[PDB]
C-alpha cells in the first residue's frame, strides 16, 4: 500500500507537540525579521529582505509587506509562495464580509479565519502546514488600531509591538525596553528601524534591504491611509532618523 | 515475514501470508462436518461455549428453503457471507423465479472472497464454510475456503481436529453415499464422523447442532432436545 510513504504531518510527539508545526516554526526563524509597532495614532511595519543582490529590481517589488484591504496589511515571515496562497484567501474573505454586511471587515475577524485555516492543516488532511508567520496591521472602528501575529500552528495573539522571523529573541527585548504606550507614530517608525539595525545579521542597514509601511489616521479626518514606502522614501526616513 | 504486511503483497515463494493466517483462524474454530447421499445432505457442527455460564455459539445458518451453511472461524464473517448468499438466493427467486443452484452459490462465494485478497486496505474473510443444498440436480455439499477455493464433495470436515472426521468419511465413503431416503441414518453417520475429531469432551444436548436438507426436506436446523435422539 501507499501508507509506506506517508510522513503523517498531523500527529503529536510523545510530549504533545506537533512535529511539523515545530519544524515550520524553525524554518521561519531563518526568515528576514519583520517588526510591527503600534502607536496611539498609527501602526508601523518594517521588514528585512533576504540578502538582496545588487541586480534585483528593488523598487517594483514586494516579498514582506502585502495589502489585504484598504484598512489592513500584513508583514510576512517564512515562505513567500505559501504566504501568497493565504493572502489571496484573506483578500477574498475581506471582500465577502463587505458584500454581506456592507461594512469593512473587523481586523480580528479576518485574522481569526486565516488562523483557523492554518489550524486545519495541523489537525486533518495529512498535508504539510504553511511555513508562514504574519504580523497583521489594521484599523477598524471598534478597537481602533490593532496588531496581531499568527504562526503555522494557527495560534494568533495581539500586540502593542512585536517581531517575527530571525532574531526575535533579541528584537523582542529591545522593543520591550524602549516602547511606551503614549508613543506617537514617528517615534515608533524610529524605534522600528533602530531595532532592525541592532538585530540585522549583516553590517550596513541600507534602504535596499528594507520594506516599510505605515497606517496613519493621517487623511481628511475619520478616514485611514495606508502607505507602502517607495525605496527613495525608505532612504529619506533612514537618513532622517540618522541611521545613514 | 516482511511479506505478511497485507494481502496486496506476494512472498518471494509466491504465497499470500495474510490469506494463510486467515486460513489459520479456521483451524482454531470448532469442528464441523458435512456429508450427503443422493437424496439428502447433512451438516453436523460441534458448538463451542465461552465458559460454563455462556451459550453455545450457533454455527449453522439457513440461506433459503433449499440451502444453508455451517461455519468455523470468525462468526461475523460467516454472518456477512451467509447474508450475501441469502440475497443471491433471493434475487434468483425474485427476478428469475428460480431456486439458486448450489454450484452457483459456490462460484459467487469464491468470487466475493477473491476481491478481498487482491485490493489494498481489505482483509481476507477469516472463516471456512460448508454448504449443503438440494437443488435441480440433487443433493450437494460444498467446502468454501477464504482463499476463494470452493470445492464440491460427498463429505468433509473443517476446523480444529477436523482431520479425524475427514479420514473417517474417506473410509466410510461407499456406505453413506448410498443412504438414500433415510434421513436418520445419514445423520447418524455425520454424528459418528464428528466423534473422530473429539478429545476430552463428547457430544451433549446443547453442544451438538445438526442440519438437514433434501428431496422432500426443507433445510431445517436441530438443536437441544431435538438432537437428544442422536447422542
Amino acid at each position: 500500500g501507499s501508507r509506506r510513504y506517508d510522513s503523517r504531518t498531523t500527529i503529536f510527539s510523545p510530549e504533545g507537540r506537533l512535529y511539523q508545526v515545530e519544524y515550520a516554526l524553525e524554518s521561519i526563524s531563518h526568515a528576514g525579521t519583520a517588526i510591527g509597532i503600534m502607536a496611539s495614532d498609527g501602526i508601523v511595519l518594517a521588514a528585512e529582505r533576504k540578502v538582496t543582490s545588487t541586480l534585483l529590481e528593488q523598487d517594483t517589488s514586494t516579498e514582506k509587506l502585502y495589502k489585504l484591504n484598504d484598512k489592513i496589511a500584513v508583514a510576512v515571515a517564512g515562505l513567500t509562495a505559501d504566504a501568497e496562497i493565504l493572502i489571496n484567501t484573506a483578500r477574498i474573505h475581506a471582500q465577502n464580509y463587505l458584500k454581506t454586511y456592507n461594512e469593512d471587515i473587523p481586523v480580528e475577524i479576518l485574522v481569526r479565519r486565516l488562523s483557523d485555516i492554518k489550524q486545519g492543516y495541523t489537525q486533518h488532511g495529512g498535508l504539510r502546514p504553511f511555513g508562514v508567520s504574519f504580523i497583521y496591521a489594521g484599523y477598524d472602528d471598534r478597537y481602533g488600531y490593532q496588531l496581531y501575529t499568527s504562526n503555522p500552528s494557527g495560534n494568533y495573539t495581539g500586540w502593542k509591538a512585536i517581531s517575527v522571523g530571525a532574531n526575535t529573541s533579541a528584537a523582542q527585548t529591545l522593543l520591550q525596553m524602549d516602547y511606551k504606550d503614549d508613543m506617537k507614530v514617528d517615534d515608533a517608525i524610529e524605534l522600528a528601524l533602530k531595532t532592525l539595525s541592532k538585530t540585522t545579521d549583516s553590517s550596513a542597514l541600507t534602504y535596499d534591504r528594507l520594506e516599510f509601511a505605515t497606517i496613519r489616521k493621517g487623511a481628511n479626518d475619520g478616514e485611514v491611509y495606508q502607505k507602502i514606502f517607495k525605496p527613495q522614501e525608505i532612504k529619506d526616513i533612514l537618513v532622517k532618523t540618522g541611521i545613514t | 515475514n516482511n511479506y505478511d504486511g497485507d494481502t496486496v503483497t506476494f512472498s518471494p515463494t509466491g504465497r499470500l501470508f495474510q490469506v494463510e493466517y486467515a486460513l489459520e483462524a479456521i483451524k482454531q474454530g470448532s469442528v464441523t462436518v458435512g456429508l450427503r447421499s443422493n437424496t439428502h445432505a447433512v451438516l453436523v457442527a460441534l458448538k463451542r461455549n465461552a465458559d460454563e455460564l455462556s451459550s453455545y455459539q450457533k454455527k449453522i445458518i439457513k440461506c433459503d428453503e433449499h440451502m444453508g451453511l455451517s461455519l468455523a472461524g470468525l462468526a461475523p464473517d460467516a454472518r456477512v457471507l451467509s447474508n450475501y448468499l441469502r440475497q443471491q438466493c433471493n434475487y434468483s427467486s425474485l427476478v428469475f423465479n428460480r431456486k439458486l443452484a448450489v454450484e452457483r452459490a459456490g462460484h459467487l462465494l469464491c468470487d466475493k472472497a477473491q476481491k478481498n485478497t487482491q485490493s489494498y486496505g481489505g482483509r481476507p474473510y477469516g472463516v471456512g464454510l460448508l454448504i449443503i443444498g438440494y437443488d435441480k440436480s440433487g443433493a450437494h455439499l460444498l467446502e468454501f475456503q477464504p482463499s476463494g477455493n470452493v470445492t464440491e464433495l460427498y463429505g468433509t470436515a473443517i476446523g480444529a481436529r477436523s482431520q479425524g472426521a475427514k479420514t473417517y468419511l474417506e473410509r466410510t465413503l461407499d456406505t453413506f453415499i448410498k443412504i438414500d431416503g433415510n434421513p436418520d441414518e445419514l445423520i447418524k453417520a455425520g454424528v459418528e464422523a464428528i466423534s473422530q475429531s473429539l478429545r476430552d469432551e463428547s457430544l451433549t444436548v446443547d453442544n451438538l447442532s445438526i442440519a438437514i436438507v433434501g428431496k422432500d426436506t426443507p433445510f431445517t436446523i436441530y438443536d437441544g432436545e431435538a438432537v437428544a435422539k442422536y447422542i
Binding site: 500500500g1 501508507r3 | 505478511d4 504486511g5 497485507d6 501470508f17 495474510q18 493466517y21 486467515a22 486460513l23 489459520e24 483462524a25 479456521i26 483451524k27 482454531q28 461455549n49 465461552a50 465458559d51 460454563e52 455460564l53 455462556s54 451459550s55 455459539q57 470468525l74 462468526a75 461475523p76 454472518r79 489494498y120 486496505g121 481489505g122 482483509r123 481476507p124 477469516g126
Partner: protein, 235 residues
C-alpha cells in the same frame, strides 16, 4: 506501521485483540439473569474525590425492555447506545412491537467490525446488554468489539472480571430470585473493587417484564448494602 485490518499469524485481528486489552483496564461490570429479572451493576470508580459521583453513567437505558452496562473506553459506547436506541425505536415503528433482545444485540454487533481504511479503529468498550422479550424471556448478552456476542446466565467484564467470573461460576443457579441476584452482584463487586463499596461508587439496576428497566436510587442500593453486610455477619 502495517494495516489496521491485518491478521496475526495466529489468525486473529491485531486491532481487535489490542482493544480487548483496553477493556481489561475498564471498571468492573456484572450482570446476572434470573427467571424474575436481570440485574446489572457497575463499579463507578471516581478518579478523584471532587468529581460528583452520580454524573458517572455506565448503566444506560436502550428501551423500556432493554438495559445496558459498559466497561472500557466508555466514550466509545456513546454512539453504540445511540445506534441501539434508534434500532429499537425504529423497529417499533416498522412493526408495532418490541424488538427482540437478541436482534437488538446482533444489530449493535454489526457496527463493531465496521472499521479500517466507516470508522478508523474498533471500539474500546464491551457491553452487557440485558433485557426481556416474549419469546425468549429474560436475557443477558456480552457484546465485544470483535463482533461476537454470547449469551450468559451471569457474566463479569472489566478489570475485576477474571476473579468475579470464577465467583459467579460457583454462585449462579437456575432458581436465583431477584433479591438474591442483587445482593450477589453487590457481594462480588465489593470483593473486586479497589475502594470500599458503598452506594456512591457503585450502582445497581434491573429489568423486569412488569416495570421494565430501572436504575436504582442511591438510597435504595444503600439498604441492599446494609442487608448484604448483615447477611454475611450470620454464620
Amino acid at each position: 506501521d502495517r494495516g489496521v485490518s491485518t491478521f496475526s499469524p495466529e489468525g486473529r485481528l491485531f486491532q481487535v485483540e489490542y482493544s480487548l486489552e483496553a477493556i481489561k483496564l475498564g471498571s468492573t461490570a456484572i450482570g446476572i439473569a434470573t427467571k424474575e429479572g436481570v440485574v446489572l451493576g457497575v463499579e463507578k470508580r471516581a478518579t478523584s474525590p471532587l468529581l460528583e459521583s452520580d454524573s458517572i453513567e455506565k448503566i444506560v437505558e436502550i428501551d423500556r425492555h432493554i438495559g445496558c452496562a459498559m466497561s472500557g473506553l466508555t466514550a466509545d459506547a456513546r454512539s453504540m447506545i445511540e445506534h441501539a436506541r434508534t434500532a429499537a425505536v425504529t423497529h417499533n415503528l416498522y412493526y408495532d412491537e418490541d424488538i427482540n433482545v437478541e436482534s437488538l444485540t446482533q444489530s449493535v454487533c454489526d457496527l463493531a467490525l465496521r472499521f479500517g481504511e466507516l470508522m478508523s479503529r474498533p471500539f474500546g468498550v464491551a457491553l452487557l446488554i440485558a433485557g426481556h422479550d416474549a419469546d425468549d424471556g429474560y436475557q443477558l448478552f456480552h457484546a465485544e468489539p470483535s463482533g461476537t456476542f454470547y449469551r450468559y446466565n451471569a457474566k463479569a467484564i472489566g478489570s475485576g472480571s477474571e476473579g468475579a467470573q470464577a465467583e459467579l461460576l460457583n454462585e449462579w443457579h437456575s432458581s436465583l430470585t431477584l433479591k438474591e441476584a442483587e445482593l450477589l452482584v453487590l457481594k462480588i463487586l465489593k470483593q473486586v473493587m479497589e475502594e470500599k463499596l458503598d452506594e456512591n461508587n457503585a450502582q445497581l439496576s434491573c429489568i423486569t417484564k412488569q416495570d421494565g428497566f430501572k436504575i436504582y436510587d442511591n438510597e435504595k442500593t444503600a439498604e441492599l448494602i446494609k442487608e448484604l453486610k448483615e447477611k454475611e455477619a450470620a454464620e
